[PDB]
Amino acid sequence: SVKEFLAKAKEDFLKKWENPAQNTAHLDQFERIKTLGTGSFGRVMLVKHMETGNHYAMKILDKQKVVKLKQIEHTLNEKRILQAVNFPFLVKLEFSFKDNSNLYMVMEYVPGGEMFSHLRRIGRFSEPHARFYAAQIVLTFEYLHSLDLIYRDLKPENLLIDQQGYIQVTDFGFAKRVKGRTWTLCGTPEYLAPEIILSKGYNKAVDWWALGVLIYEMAAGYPPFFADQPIQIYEKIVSGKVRFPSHFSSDLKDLLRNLLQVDLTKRFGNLKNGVNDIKNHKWFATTDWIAIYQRKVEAPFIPKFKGPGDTSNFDDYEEEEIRVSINEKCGKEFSEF
Amino acid sequence: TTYADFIASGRTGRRNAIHD
Ligand SMILES: O=S(=O)(c1cccc2cnccc12)N1CCCNCC1
Structure with a gap:
C-alpha cells in the first residue's frame, strides 16, 4: 500500500x-x-x-x-x-x-x-522536535529515491518551515536522476559522505549519511565533524570517529551509529530492507508515518x-x-x- | 567544551557548497 x-x-x-x-x-x-x-x-x-x-x-x-x-x-x-x-x-x-x-x-x-535560523536561535532541538523533522525527511527521501533521484544537498540552510510548521524542500540544483552510480564532487563539507571525499563512485547512500549528520546537528546544536578548514573536516569524516553528547538517548546513538557508518555495505538505508531499517528503528517507535504524510500531527514549533x-x-x-x-x-x- | 570548539571554528553561519 x-x-x-x-x-x-x-x-x-x-x-x-x-x-x-x-x-x-x-x-x-x-x-x-x-x-x-x-x-x-x-x-x-x-x-x-x-x-x-x-x-x-x-x-x-x-x-x-x-x-x-x-x-x-x-x-x-x-x-x-x-x-x-x-x-x-x-x-x-x-x-x-x-x-x-x-x-x-x-x-x-x-x-x-530556514530551519537554520531557528536552530541557531534556540541552540538545539529536543529529541522529539528533532524526530518530527527527521521523519519528514525520511519520507521525502523514500519518495525521491524511488524516482531514482539523489538529493545531495541536505542541510538546515536548505529546509524551510511552513505556516503549519512542517518542512519544505527547495533547491534541486544538485539533485541528479540516475540509476547506478555517480562521481561528482559536490555538496557542503560538513555533510559530505566519506565515499564522496575519497572520490569513490557513489549512490543514494550518501543521502542517508546526510540525514545522520542532520539528525545529530539538530539534537546537538552543532555538526558531528567540524574544523577551521574543509580539508581538516574531510579528515574527520573518513575516520568515522563520532563522539556523542551525554544528553543523547541511547536509542538516538544507536541510529546515528547506523547512519554515520563509514562502510557503505552496513549503512542503514543501504541494506536489503532499505528505508524500512530506518522507519522500524526504536528511535522512531512513537512515530506515526502515515499521520506525518497527511500532516495531521500538531507541530511542536510554529513560526510567528x-x-x-x-x-x-x-x-x-x-x-x-x-x-x-x-x-x-x-x-x-x-x-x- | 565541544560547544566552545564549534564557535572557534568559524563555521557557525550559513555554509556554502563547493562546485566543479
Ligand atoms: O529561502 S529561499 O530564498 C527560498 C527558495 C525557494 C522558495 C522559497 C519560498 N519561500 C520562501 C523562501 C524560498 N532559499 C534560497 C536561498 C538559500 N536557502 C534555501 C531556500
Missing part, C-alpha cells in the same frame, strides 16, 4: 518529466517586494501577483552569470525536477518564464524561514506570522535593481527553459 503509492507516484512523475511546462507568465505581472535570499548566480524575491494579490517567492537567475559559472545543466535540471515532482514536503512551482536577461521561477512563498507577505523570519539583504537588457543573451543555451 506504500509500494502502490510509489508506483503510482513514479508513473505520474515520468509523464510530467517527458511532457512538461514553458512561458506560463511575465515579469510585469508581479510587484517585487523584498529579497529573501542571495546566491552566486541568483536571488529569491517575495513578489505579489498584481492580478490576484497572492504572494510568491520568485527565483531570478542571471543567464550570463549562469553560463560564466558553468551551471547551465544544473539550472535546467532544477526546473525540470520541480515541475515533475509532487509531495507535501517539496515546494510547488507555479510559473516559469524567461526574458532577454533572466530566468525566472515562481514558487509558493514559505514564510517560516503577522499576515500574508510578512518577511520577519528571513534575513535582510541588499536590494538590487532588476536589469533587463535590450539584447537577448544566451538564447541557444537556454532554449529548453
Whole structure:
C-alpha cells in the first residue's frame, strides 16, 4: 500500500518529466517586494501577483552569470525536477518564464524561514522536535529515491518551515536522476559522505549519511565533524570517529551509529530492507508515518506570522535593481527553459 | 567544551557548497 503509492507516484512523475511546462507568465505581472535570499548566480524575491494579490517567492537567475559559472545543466535540471515532482514536503512551482536577461521561477512563498535560523536561535532541538523533522525527511527521501533521484544537498540552510510548521524542500540544483552510480564532487563539507571525499563512485547512500549528520546537528546544536578548514573536516569524516553528547538517548546513538557508518555495505538505508531499517528503528517507535504524510500531527514549533507577505523570519539583504537588457543573451543555451 | 570548539571554528553561519 506504500509500494502502490510509489508506483503510482513514479508513473505520474515520468509523464510530467517527458511532457512538461514553458512561458506560463511575465515579469510585469508581479510587484517585487523584498529579497529573501542571495546566491552566486541568483536571488529569491517575495513578489505579489498584481492580478490576484497572492504572494510568491520568485527565483531570478542571471543567464550570463549562469553560463560564466558553468551551471547551465544544473539550472535546467532544477526546473525540470520541480515541475515533475509532487509531495507535501517539496515546494510547488507555479510559473516559469524567461526574458532577454533572466530566468525566472515562481514558487509558493514559505514564510517560516530556514530551519537554520531557528536552530541557531534556540541552540538545539529536543529529541522529539528533532524526530518530527527527521521523519519528514525520511519520507521525502523514500519518495525521491524511488524516482531514482539523489538529493545531495541536505542541510538546515536548505529546509524551510511552513505556516503549519512542517518542512519544505527547495533547491534541486544538485539533485541528479540516475540509476547506478555517480562521481561528482559536490555538496557542503560538513555533510559530505566519506565515499564522496575519497572520490569513490557513489549512490543514494550518501543521502542517508546526510540525514545522520542532520539528525545529530539538530539534537546537538552543532555538526558531528567540524574544523577551521574543509580539508581538516574531510579528515574527520573518513575516520568515522563520532563522539556523542551525554544528553543523547541511547536509542538516538544507536541510529546515528547506523547512519554515520563509514562502510557503505552496513549503512542503514543501504541494506536489503532499505528505508524500512530506518522507519522500524526504536528511535522512531512513537512515530506515526502515515499521520506525518497527511500532516495531521500538531507541530511542536510554529513560526510567528503577522499576515500574508510578512518577511520577519528571513534575513535582510541588499536590494538590487532588476536589469533587463535590450539584447537577448544566451538564447541557444537556454532554449529548453 | 565541544560547544566552545564549534564557535572557534568559524563555521557557525550559513555554509556554502563547493562546485566543479
Ligand atoms: O529561502 S529561499 O530564498 C527560498 C527558495 C525557494 C522558495 C522559497 C519560498 N519561500 C520562501 C523562501 C524560498 N532559499 C534560497 C536561498 C538559500 N536557502 C534555501 C531556500
